[PDB]
Design a protein around this ligand. Sequence first.
Ligand SMILES: *[PH](O)(O)OCC(C)(C)[C@H](O)C(=O)NCCC(=O)NCCSCCC(=O)CCc1ccccc1
Length: 86
Amino acid sequence: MATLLTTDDLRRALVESAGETDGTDLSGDFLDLRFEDIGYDSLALMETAARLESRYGVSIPDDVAGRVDTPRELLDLINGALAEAA
Ligand SMILES: *[PH](O)(O)OCC(C)(C)[C@H](O)C(=O)NCCC(=O)NCCSCCC(=O)CCc1ccccc1
């Protein structure tokens, strides 16, 4: 069953990939903002991705990783892939 995750869980899991006194306050919004904009490259970002992949049992496609500028689009990607996994 496709268990679509919420934006709350995503927010929290994005924090786990950094530490404590090295991150910003993910509050208000983080969906219409960029990853470069929040001090995330790719490496630390894939850690966040794998955090979710392993939990829901998914796998992120390679070409499609270059289609997410915003967390907004990343959420659609995972939500959509879940829907096709049934
Ligand atoms: P950054 O430093 O540009 O990239 C992080 C990775 C982990 C890819 C780093 O370059 C590295 O050491 N890679 C070794 C091979 C590896 O782990 N590959 C992972 C699968 S292939 C990566 C495809 C991507 O381009 C993913 C990058 C990404 C993901 C999500 C949003 C934006 C960019």
